[PDB]
Amino acid sequence: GNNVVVLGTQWGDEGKGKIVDLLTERAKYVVRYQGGHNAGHTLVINGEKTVLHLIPSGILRENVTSIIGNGVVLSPAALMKEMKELEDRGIPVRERLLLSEACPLILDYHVALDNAREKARGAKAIGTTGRGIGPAYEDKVARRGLRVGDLFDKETFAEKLKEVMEYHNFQLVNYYKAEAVDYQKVLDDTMAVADILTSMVVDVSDLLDQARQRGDFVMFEGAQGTLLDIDHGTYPYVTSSNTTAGGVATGSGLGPRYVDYVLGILKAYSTRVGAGPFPTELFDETGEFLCKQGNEFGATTGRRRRTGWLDTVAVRRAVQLNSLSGFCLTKLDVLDGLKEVKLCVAYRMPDGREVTTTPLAADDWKGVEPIYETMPGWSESTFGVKDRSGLPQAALNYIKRIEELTGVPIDIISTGPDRTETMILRDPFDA
Template sequence: MSVTLIVGGQWGDEGKAKIIDILARDADYVVRFQGGANAGHTVVVGKECFKFHLVPSGILYPDITCVLGGGMVIDPLALAEEIEFIKSRGIDVRDRIFVSEQAHVVLPHHILMDRSQEAKKGSGKIGSTGRGITPAYMDKVGREGMRMGEFLRSSEEFRSIVRKKVTEKNRLLRLFGFPAISPSKTEKDFLAARRKLKPLIADTRIMLWDAIEKNKRIFCEGAQGALLDVDHGTYPFVTSSSAIAGGAAVGAGLPPSSIRRIIGVLKAYCTRVGNGPFPTEDKGKNGDRLRDLGQEYGTTTGRPRRCGWFDAVAARTTTKLNGVTEIALTKLDILVGFDKIKICTAYRIGKKRIEYFPTDSRILAKCRPEYEVIDGWKTPTLVGGSLRLSKQAEHYVQLLEKLIGCKITMVSLGPERHAVVQR
């Protein structure tokens, strides 16, 4: 059985969790492969709303095993708290959550440095969530990080490792004028988290390799989106990890050849959190309306998202970059009631017309969108209560397919599980 990968094709917040939740009912494993608690995945089941930051959203299905892969950076205190929250909602997590011993640990100084550095940037802020993600990845690349496998050591060894890390980083914190972290408090907090997390830590690569050999169904759940990828996104206004399909094999420890189905998730309009170029951003009433109707506020930070029209140039680029085999389009219901709907088909810089997404953010910031304008639709997106798109909505979907060059197989029309049209 091959691996299915779900990735975001915009700046994150595309509604990946909804698509994963729908598809995961057929899965045996759901795997996170990058990022950390900076992700925010929301799933609505009946009248209940679940928000996940570290644990894969597949945990809502009782027969699914959830894996936090080695490409992640994990705040053990946040993970322990999230697991307790999940248990409090009546979900059995025993033998269902496993954490890669290769994943790196987010320590208190990472969070402090992240928030302090972001605050000092003033108007030049990247838009960090303040969860310590960037400093943790910096330590990983600098070969100074702590990995989750350290939680498997004896209590004394673990205590010594934590104290050493905190003491070393306190020297750096003082050098840059930051307050020191308490070694004793960190030891106490991490030992408490260790008691809860130690049974979950394993070499998850072997687990997944064995699952592939046994023809188990594996779904990989991407966080953020391709336009936030550290290499291919709008650098430097990006996340610190690889958020594209190519990062899944590395972050999960899967053979690249095992990934056969790649579903790109796109919102029917565009949003972005934080700073950085955003060619189709609408700073007027239409942008405000999209934000209000779509409840576009960050799951992790609560920050209002910048909103604008669908960018087919960006979508075309990320579809090719990820090798997307099919697209899931979300939040089409939000466009109901607009008199006119715009779709960006190309960019212009002065008199020059370009149909590709620039790699240089300074160039992208100068790009002005060239729009195709179509009539909106007043009628509900569903026809007669059935799971069928109205004529106008179907026209919009077909136009996006043509502009992107990829089949849209799923259209989401609301947060509920049942509000999906299969095409």
Template sequence: MPLTMLSLDPAPFPLLPAIAGGGCVPGPRLHAPRRFCWPLRAASVAPPAAEEPSAAARERLESLSQVAGVLGTQWGDEGKGKLVDILAQRFDVVARCQEFFNENTQCVIGNGAVIHLPGFFKEIDGLESNGISCEGRILVSDRAHLLFDLHQIVDGLREAELGNSLIGTTKRGIGPCYSNKVIRNGLRVSDLRHMSTFTAKLNTLLRDAAMRFKDFEYDNKILKEEVEKYERFAERLEPFIADTVHFMNESILQKKKILVEGGQATMLDIDFGTYPFVTSSSPSAGGICTGLGIAPRSLGDLIGVVKAYTTRVGSGPFPTELLGKAGDLLRASGMEFGTTTGRPRRCGWLDIVALKYSCQINGFSSLNLTKLDVLTGLKEVKLGISYCTDDGNTVESFPADLDLLEQIKVKYEVLPGWENDISSVRDYNDLPETARLYIQRIEELVGIPVHYIGVGPGRDALIYK
């Protein structure tokens, strides 16, 4: 999302962004299979009522600021949705750049998101078929950009052109949609209210794609069918459309509690990630403000979500990647396969250099360490604590130069592992001593406390520290 808020794309921010597989593109996103607005995220279906939280949990949750954010620190798939689902129970508004719907909150898809209406309505239909009414519960920014099927087709054609140098996109059309936004010929939700000019604008997008790609099919019949489809969409979407900038700022003035979730993650940020192997929006803290239209001074606590190890999908540098059996073991134990695409994720040790870089950019107040249980059974665990060149010179921070990043050497710190199953542990002091040592060492190296620790896939498998 620039936080790509409400982008409904797996790239930017969650705060009112849309989702990548479905309706909205880059912005913060809330949960994987739902994707109507990639940068922003409305909220996921409310989970079953959980048992009463412990005193420690209540204290931690109640101490959060009026406007709080949850952002990914690595290359995505850190497990942000689980924490957001839990926190959402104590907030009035949940905004995102990706998908997300919580039954007990007002959900917002912000201007930073891109929204794929067929995917959006499919999600709405799924929710309502399960007895969850969305009427008056989801707001879609009139400034959010529309992601068309043509964007998805173009995304695939672009990747095919790149051959072996492909970026590794999800082919959801997020990049092409943001491209149109930036060159100022994209269509926004507000354009649906002016169908007299909508046809000409959509014709421009289709014509440009046909001129650029010989395999892109386009004629007047296709244009007519698209326009007719979007006339129906316009009527159905109208009750959801709102000036979300006004809504968000009024909510702040009314002292409502607001939770923002970013899509994608910091290392996929268009500016700060491993460019060009990144998303098309800003899923770092700055994307919250630009993707939702709220002032920086409104932001309070920002929670960075980080796996106990590192993963990434698609192409691009990965300094701590484990190849061979070691990587396969982590992948199998952590079920590291793309939620939307099913692609196997590349796995490696926790990269402290990249994590510190992410923390600097976002200014996190605390961290949520997820999937600690996946490391159970390893005789030793490693932390990639620094980078150096072939000649031994230390690289002070995460470099922009991909050639350097591909050749970089990682210095590791080796810590003892633990054998005992930790999935049922709910008190920090009940964790094995070596697991606590691992967490404490991460805190020391990045200078930020770990307040939430995931120890299993269950919603309640969370330790509040």
């Protein structure tokens, strides 16, 4: 359909980057609706060589308008760095990007809090959380934060900013024993950027209503994996916001009924970064094989990604939560060379009961044992294949089995980083 949602169906790192660049070639509007400066996108597919964490890759294409919805927490410092960075590369960012007046602002004290929490809690163990994304979401729901619209009335901004800073400084020094952030400095850093940010503000709700009825192709883009959904993922091993397709309405202002197609990116195997339940995790050279052939090193500074077989039970939960229309399968070639391949079809519970549904957070994620289905592997390479006929029989059976177990089709298959090394079986836009 005309309005499409693209998101990861697992726990992150599924390989959505390329698909997004590919599908952004046909879109008029590209919209961010959740998370913050944690998108992660290394430009290669037409993009020089840089990682954008806030602005969408649609910012490269001259025919598209990139929109940052209200569901996105906005750090004025992160943005300006990315802009000037692109502007240095001659990309006219300020005339191709639009923002919502309701986007919460991430500010020095928000980062300051995160850095202390990562200290206060536990201990120094690769504290990769000092971003300020969660704290901006807290101030919002608690109704004491600031938004972009607030930058319209500079007088009242100072007033508001002082009241909220006083409160954060209190806990910073009297509870955390950290340093106090300086109010005047933050007011100054913000004031100097205000005229710029407001020149981009637009009524995002009304604009999309226009695109929809006019019939334009709008691509909605998710940034974190589905199972990290604050509400339905593995609590507390979840993010600070909703990551499923259900977040498109609140994070952008459009009605839930105006979601046509929902494309879910599925990697051929499993990976998790950090703590949290993971039944299919492999603690052998297979897990190793998958880690090395998949470049699953996405965790620099003494860290790593957990590896494993595809878990159709967990994926089933994603289908449910995201009302997925189709799947896009990635990293299938990582499997080339495996004598046998496995697929988790059911979880066995402690009392011997087998179930096809994910455990109620408060349950046996700890006691569940994986019911595997083992199937033949392949020796021939799949990398770069551009037609289903280039695929061996075993890989074709794997793919269809996923479909049977899951009940949803695989409408796109990516066999390599090149645009043409893609198999579009249905096309999200024109179907």
